[PDB]
Amino acid sequence: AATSRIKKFSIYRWDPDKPGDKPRMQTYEVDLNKCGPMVLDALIKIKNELDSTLTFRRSCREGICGSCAMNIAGGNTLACTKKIDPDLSKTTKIYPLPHMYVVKDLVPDLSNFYAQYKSIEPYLKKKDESKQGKEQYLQSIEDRQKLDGLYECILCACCSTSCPSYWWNGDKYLGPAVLMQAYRWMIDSRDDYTEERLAQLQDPFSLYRCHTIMNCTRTCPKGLNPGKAIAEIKKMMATYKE
Amino acid sequence: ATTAKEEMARFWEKNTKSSRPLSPHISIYKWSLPMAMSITHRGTGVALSLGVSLFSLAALLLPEQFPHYVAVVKSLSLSPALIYSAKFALVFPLSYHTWNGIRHLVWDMGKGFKLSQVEQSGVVVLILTLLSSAGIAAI
Amino acid sequence: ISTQYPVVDHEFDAVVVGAGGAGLRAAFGLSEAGFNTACVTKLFPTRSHTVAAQGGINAALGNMEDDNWRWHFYDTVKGSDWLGDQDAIHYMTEQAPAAVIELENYGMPFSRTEEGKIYQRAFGGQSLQFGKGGQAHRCCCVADRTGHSLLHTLYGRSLRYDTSYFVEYFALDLLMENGECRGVIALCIEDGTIHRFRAKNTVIATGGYGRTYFSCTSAHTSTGDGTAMVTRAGLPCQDLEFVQFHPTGIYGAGCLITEGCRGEGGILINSQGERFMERYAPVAKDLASRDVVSRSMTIEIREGRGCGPEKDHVYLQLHHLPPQQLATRLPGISETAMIFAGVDVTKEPIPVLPTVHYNMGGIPTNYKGQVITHVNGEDKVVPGLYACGEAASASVHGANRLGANSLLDLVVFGRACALTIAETCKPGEPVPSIKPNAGEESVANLDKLRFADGTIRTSEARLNMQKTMQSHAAVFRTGSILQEGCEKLSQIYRDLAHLKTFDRGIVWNTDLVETLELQNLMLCALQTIYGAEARKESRGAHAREDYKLRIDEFDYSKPLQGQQKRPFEEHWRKHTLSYVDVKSGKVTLKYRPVIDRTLNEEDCSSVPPAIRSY
Amino acid sequence: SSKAASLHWTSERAVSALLLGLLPAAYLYPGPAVDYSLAAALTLHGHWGLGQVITDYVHGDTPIKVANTGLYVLSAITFTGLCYFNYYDVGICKAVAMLWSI
Ligand SMILES: *Cc1cc2c(cc1C)nc1c(=O)[nH]c(=O)nc-1n2C[C@H](O)[C@H](O)[C@H](O)COP(=O)(O)OP(=O)(O)OC[C@H]1O[C@@H](n2cnc3c(N)ncnc32)[C@H](O)[C@@H]1O
Ligand SMILES: CCCCCCO[C@@H]1O[C@H](CO)[C@@H](O)[C@H](O)[C@H]1O
Ligand code: SF4
Ligand code: F3S
Ligand code: FES
């Protein structure tokens, strides 16, 4: 109502349709008294009420779809679940996921990331696939438990775009996102290609560019630990037999 | 459809010839102790290696043998302070890199991955680094 | 008219539009069956609203107790308040077990029972022995993240086939010729190009349109885009006034709090500590149908027993349940409760309120997934057009959907669509031609909005629509209020000529995309509130306080023995078919009979209307 | 060998663990045996390590080829010079001790 609390946001901007445009930071003032508690709430309010040209991804609005991942106050997170910092003395800086080709504004081109995911064959593979569809495969509570902390990934790419290794060798290093998923299939008690899944990582980059920086785990919006999955892979990588 | 390898290839092809800018990273990313201790582990390893390489080079190139250089220095009867300061500075890198290297070996065993334990192991590393250096620079 | 926009033409055997759970299943189902398939979606597949589904997907597997798909069939038919086509419901429920087993064999990380099988929980309105043997436990699930897993499993599976995806392409309209669908036209958001995908068959699985409302559980992306393209094709949409308000969307944010909470032992409580459902549905209590639970909660609030400082919501209590159970069965909502309500479900209740959630109505199809038109009293399938998922109206949900029946719906009919095109067509068959300027009107409209410089900005119009639908078409409805809404609404729709956009580019112009979604949304809201106003009866989710009874062809509360069957035109047990004159925004209605026969009376008996209470 | 990448990763760790043990061994049993072990261990560890660095930060077929080439020289030279010191001079342990006498 009456008695505002104006917060400033410096957001990255780049129009691929303004010939010869240069990335620039634009600042927006928002009244937190007439805005939802989340940064996405702020981003939407801005596009709706001050600059409908501010472009970005969003959909779910509850942190499950992974669409809105961006860099807020130097860290990768989901705009839709990151509380706006109430300290009016600070201007929150919003950038696109780091080291990514910017398609427009806060929208990164994630196709390489998607292709990397495709490359590890994230889907159940059984030697005999002659019986697909006749009966539920059996999996114990204990084996289904090993999947917790792995299946929840929403493929948001915050962790991978936070890892310096992926910043320097993203073309060959799969990244925490995809690697954890590769591990997600390695330990599914129902999959029969564990050895082949490891074989695919027998090169200097795919997996071994991880030097345990742990930015990934710190940045994960779902509280997942890709960094640890990666280390379990290394232990398998170095114990499996042909 | 397009295979993953095909997609990666057009991704680079498309973008490297585009007018699309690269979003910033190292210049805008928020640091943490873990991150900082991690690259420091790199800088120290490298420095230890360049140090070990300068030593072997000198063993093959300098006219005089080690004992003479040691003497030369003892003949300057330098302030212990400076003596201690140099020794400390000498062993810090090694100490930091050693303790933190043990940290990495523990991680390689797959232990200490909870983010809060990463912060713990690191701080322990930092104090052990500080203590071992002081101890040694004093020996 | 000038091609200021370049055009790229594609030719496939099939074009699937939408890549949520239904679209994905339809798309590789087609590729799997040999068809050179294109899948066009505005979102990267895993971003689809489906990924947010929580509680589960029903199937009489019998992993918890002995089951019978026929019992599931009955629960659904009863659930739909008899507005559901029983042939479809028959198909859907008999196929369930196989469809779910198929998801598991794809790798869906279902939760497990002690016997290594798919763990199933209880859900609203499911019973054993056709309503006589107590609570059913057939909601197969992945903790409270079944949608997320289902969508990831399907996307991963699709990676194995030659399906061509066109991600972040916004489908504008259908390419209609002589009442047959030739394909679709779209805007490629990444590069500002126009694309025409000619195919012999088009499947529309574009999701619902909960964003016609101010407060929904739906994603900002649920804007009924495909529903809208049907309208613009001159085809009718069905039962749009049948909007489901989920009992427990969290207070404030709107995020859904799965019914799975109640399935696991959660209870609704008023500002007086009362478990009021023991009073509105003495038997099912908190597990009554959604329309029922939502109305019940609503009365409690307007009657003054609502909780919180504004007494505008009630409490979902879970804290009486063991903590390991909450962690194992409801990990998702536990976190969501904390994030959006600061609630620790192990100590305090979650503030909830009925929230627009799902659309029972949609593009009308037959049980094979084929879109149907209704001329002179007969259902005719529109050649080359199919629909599945929430975007459709098979209708297996009729006037009210049983929770966990959509995720089922999605995979069953998405596969049906595939199986059907397959038995009907052959891969490679010569793709139908399209006139050189086909779609030219979509570009027109597109370019018109891109430069709009009126007085009313999109966000302003939209909000006008959402607020109108919110107070004129809620849980309880009335003719005067609905009549008001219909006009306000038609005003807003006329006022779209006063629209102002600002972004003038074409690449990733979401200013423009969201304006197209407003046109799309309005087409849906109109049909929804007008159909509501015309439907003078109370059925399932549609509750008219001025017409509190359900009106069938017979009064089924008494013996039919010597009853003058009411004429079609004098009772409401029929599907609403809406049409809209795009230009004016004039809504036109017609009705078609509800299909009561099953696919085999010997195998599954048609179930006659009856009193519907829980 | 198909398992080259993992064999290396292991060897790398094995060598660090090796080099770690020589630290206490050089202070408790200083002499030739340890001095050479340190020469070998320090050279190898520093080599593999500098290679990870090049691998991470050097791109292009040629630049890489180059960096790697010159690393291989730096390392053989280093191992050589360390071995010279051990043979013609006091050796690593005794030297440290003397340095730690100033
Ligand atoms: C909102 C909601 C719904 C829901 C639920 C939880 C939430 C928070 N939980 C459920 C549950 O546990 N069990 C169940 O059976 N249902 C549940 N629901 C309802 C159900 O999820 C939905 O009915 C179902 O997900 C529908 O999905 P469908 O496959 O029909 O599609 P979608 O997910 O909505 O995705 C739409 C796809 O279409 C594409 N699209 C849309 N517009 C366009 C345009 N214009 N151009 C091209 N493509 C378009 C989208 O990109 C998407 O892929
Ligand atoms: C090169 C920049 C030096 C910054 C070193 C420490 O940085 C601090 O580390 C803490 C512990 O992880 C974080 O919680 C904190 O946010 C971060 O600023
Ligand atoms: S691991 Fe965490 S952050 Fe990385 S993608 Fe999955 S969820 Fe997003
Ligand atoms: S930050 Fe990168 S280096 Fe490895 S542990 Fe995480 S992937
Ligand atoms: S909008 Fe879905 S994760 Fe943020």
Class of residue A149 by CB neighbours under 10 A (exposed 0-12, middle 13-18, buried 19+): middle
Place of tokens 């304006």: C515
Write out the residue range of the structural domain in which residue D95 sits: 1-102
Identify which of C62, D6, C3, D56 has the alpha carbon closest to the alpha carbon of residue A242. D6
Q: Which residues of A touch D6 (CB under 8 A)?
A: 202, 234, 237-238
Task: Decide if C130 touches A, using CB distance below 8 A.
Answer: no
Is the same domain home to B59 and B85? yes
Question: How many Å lie between the alpha carbon of B65 and the closest alpha carbon of chain A?
Answer: 39
Experimental method of this PDB entry: X-ray
Rounded-to-integer distance, Cα A78 and Cα A81, Å: 6
The C-alpha angle C208, C214, C216, rounded to 5 degrees, equals 45
Which residues, including other chains, have CB under 8 Å from residue A129's CB and lie 6 or more apart? none
Residues B36 and B87 in one domain: yes
Closest by CA position to C423, among listed C411, C415, C431:
C415
Which ligand gives the minimal distance to the CA of A116?
A: 3
Residues A61 and A145 in one domain: no
Question: Do residues C198 and C12 touch, judged by C-beta distance below 8 A?
Answer: yes
* Residues A67 and A161 both lie in one domain: no
Return contacts of A199-203, CB within 8 angstroms, 24+ apart: A199/D2, A200/A120, A201/A174, A201/A233, A201/A237, A201/D5, A202/A237, A202/D2, A202/D3, A202/D4, A202/D5, A202/D6, A203/A172, A203/D5
DSSP characters over C370-438? EEEEEETTEEEEEEEEEE-GGGEE-SSSTTSPPTTSHHHHHHHHHHHHHHHHHHH--TT-PPPP--TTT
Determine whether the interchain pair A238/D2 forms a contact, defined as Cβ–Cβ distance below 8 Å. no
Copy the structure tokens of residue C36. Answer: 């050179």
Which residue's C-alpha comes closest to atom 16 of ligand 2?
A: B32
- State how far the Cα of A9 lies from the Cα of A30, in Å rounded to an integer: 8
Let me know whether B20 and B81 are in one domain. no
Instruction: Identify whether residues B95 and B82 lie together within a single domain.
Output: yes
Query: What are the angstrom distances between the C-alpha of C158 and each of A25, A125, A130, A190, C307?
Result: 40, 13, 18, 19, 46
Taking residue C362's Cβ as centre, other Cβ atoms within 10 Å add up to: 32
**Same-domain status, A117 and A228:** yes
Rounded CA gap, D102 and D86, in Å?
21
What the block records as the tokens of B30 is 């928020």
Residues B62 and B106 in one domain: yes
Which of C70, C121, C145, C290 is catalytic? The answer is C290
- Amino acid B28 reads I
Q: Are C85 and C595 in contact (CB under 8 A)?
A: yes
The Å distance, Cα B109 to ligand 4 centre, comes to 16
Asked if residue C127 has a cis previous peptide bond (ω within 30° of 0), the answer is no
Mark yes or no for CB contact A213/B34 under 8 Å. yes
Indicate the number of domains in chain A: 2
Domain containing A60 equals 1-109
Q: Which residues of C touch B (CB under 8 A)?
A: 161-165
Q: Rounded distance, CA D42 to CA D19, Å?
A: 7
Render the burial of C125-158: b for 16+ CB within 10 Å, e for the rest: bbbbebbeeeebbbbbbbbbbbbbbbbbbbbbbb
* B10 and B47 housed in the same domain: no
Write down all domains in chain C, each with its CATH number in brackets: 1-249+354-432 (3.50.50.60), 250-353 (3.90.700.10), 433-549 (1.20.58.100), 550-614 (4.10.80.40)
Does B29 contact A162 at a Cβ distance shorter than 8 Å? yes
Q: Which of A59, A66, A140 is facing C221, going by the closest CB pair?
A: A59
Residue A205 identity (one-letter amino acid)? F
CB C238 within 8 A of CB C199: no
Interface of D with A in 25-84 (CB under 8 A): 52, 55-57
Residues A7 and A79 in one domain: yes
Distance of alpha carbon C216 from the chain centroid: 12
Q: Which residue has the tokens 């109305």?
A: C295
Q: For residues A210 and A143, what is the distance between their CA atoms, to the nearest angstrom?
A: 27
A204 CB near a chain D CB, below 8 Å? yes
Hey, how many other C-beta atoms are within 10 angstroms of the C-beta on C611?
Answer: 7
**Which resolution, in Å, applies to this structure?**
2.3
Residue nearest to atom 2 of ligand 4 (CA): A163
* Chain A residues lying within 8 Å of C104, measured CB to CB: 136-137
**Does B74 sit within 8 Å of D102, measured CB to CB?**
yes
**Same domain (yes/no): A91, A114:** no
Say how many residues make up chain D. 102
Four-residue CA torsion sign, B2, B3, B8, B9:
negative
* Strand ranges in C144-257 using DSSP code E only, listed in sequence order: 164-167, 169-177, 180-188, 193-198, 201-204, 237-238, 243-250
CB A35 within 8 A of CB A52: no
For residues B113 and B137, state if they share a domain.
Answer: yes
Q: Is C290 a catalytic residue?
A: yes
Smallest CA–CA distance, residue D48 to chain B, in Å, is: 11
Tokens of C90: 């028959």
Given a contact cutoff of 8 angstroms between Cβ atoms, the answer to whether A183 and A197 are in contact is: no
C272 contacts: CB under 8 Å, gap ≥ 6 = C305
Query: C17-35 as b/e, with b when 16 or more CB fall inside 10 Å?
Result: bbbbbbbbbbbbbbbbbeb
- The conformation of residue C186, written as its DSSP 8-state character, comes to E
Compute, in degrees rounded to 10, the torsion defined by CA atoms A116, A119, A120, A124: 130
Distances (CA, A) of D38 to A76, A188, B15, D23: 43, 44, 48, 9
Give the CATH number for residue B27: 1.20.5.540
What is the Cα–Cα distance from D29 to D26, expressed in whole angstroms? Answer: 5
Report how many Cβ contacts below 8 Å link chain B to chain C: 6
Between CA C210 and CA C194 the distance in angstroms is: 27
Q: CB of A197 within 8 Å of any CB in chain D?
A: no
Same domain for A37 and A143, yes or no, is: no
Q: Considering only CA atoms, which of C207, C181, C232, C238 is closest in space to residue C363?
A: C238
Listed residues A71, A88, A109: the one ending a domain: A109
Contact B57 D85 (CB under 8 A): no
Q: Which run of H or of E encompasses C500?
A: strand C499-500
Mode of pairing for the β-strands spanning C392-393 and C363-364? parallel
Contact yes or no for C99/C415 (Cβ under 8 A): yes
Residue B51: its H or E element: helix B33-61
Q: What CATH number does the domain containing A140 carry?
A: 1.10.1060.10
CB contact A212 to D (< 8 Å): no
Same domain membership, residue A42 and residue A115: no
Q: Residues B67, B117: one domain?
A: yes
Mutate to test the pocket of ligand 5, among A39, A68, A82 (most ligand atoms within 8 A of CB): A68
CATH code at position A9: 3.10.20.30
Residues A91 and A146 in one domain: no
CATH of the domain at D30: 1.20.1300.10
Verify whether the Cβ–Cβ distance D55 to A209 is below 8 Å. Answer: yes
Q: In what order do the strands lie in the sheet with C350-359?
A: C243-250, C350-359, C314-317, C267-269
Contacts of D2 in chain A (CB under 8 A): 199, 202, 242
Does ligand 3 have an atom closer than 6 angstroms to the CB of A220?
yes
**Chain centroid to CA A75: how far?**
12
Number of domains in chain D: 1
Residues of chain D in contact with residue B105, where contact means CB-CB under 8 angstroms, are 13, 16-17, 20
Residue-number span of the structural domain to which B126 is assigned: 32-139
Q: Are residues A99 and A134 in the same domain?
A: no
Which residues on adjacent β-strands are paired with residue A76?
A: A71
Q: Looking at the structure, do residues B56 and B113 belong to the same domain, yes or no?
A: yes
Residue C524 CA: distances (Å) to CA of C50, C113, C254, C498, C520: 20, 42, 21, 20, 7
Domain co-membership, B64 together with B23: no
CB of D10 less than 8 A from some CB of B? no
Q: Are residues A49 and A73 in the same domain?
A: yes
Per the DSSP assignment, residues forming a β-bridge with C379 are C374
CA distance A190 to A195: 13
Q: Residue B101 maps to which CATH number?
A: 1.20.1300.10
- Verify whether ligand 2 is closer than 6 Å to residue B132 (CB atom): no
Helix (H) or strand (E) segment spanning residue A10: strand A6-13
If contacts are CB pairs under 8 Å, which of residues 176-205 in chain A contact chain B?
Answer: none
What is d(CA C520, CA C499) in angstroms, rounded to the nearest whole number?
14
Task: Out of A109, A128, A153, pick the residue that ends a domain.
Answer: A109
Three-class SS state of B119: helix
The answer to whether the beta carbons of residues C210 and C254 sit under 8 Å apart is no
As a whole number of angstroms, the distance between CA C69 and CA A16 comes to 55
Q: What is the 3-state secondary structure (H, E, C) of C353-368?
A: EEEEEEECCEEEECCC
Q: Which of A43, A77, A109 is the last residue of a domain?
A: A109
Q: Is A103 within 8 Å of C507 (Cβ atoms)? A: yes
Pairing of the two strands A6-13 and A24-31: antiparallel
Asked whether residue A240 falls in the same domain as residue A140, the answer is yes
Contacts of C578 (CB under 8 A, 6+ apart): C231, C236, C237, C238, C240, C526, C527, C530, C531, C587, C588, C589
The interface residues of chain A toward chain D in range 137-196, judged by CB-CB distance below 8 A, are: 165, 168-169
Q: Are residues A202 and A117 in the same domain?
A: yes
To which residue do tokens 């459902």 refer?
C277
Tell me the C-alpha distance between C594 and C395, whole Å. Answer: 9
Verify whether the Cβ–Cβ distance A107 to C43 is below 8 Å.
no
Q: Which two tokens stand for residue C147?
A: 């949608």
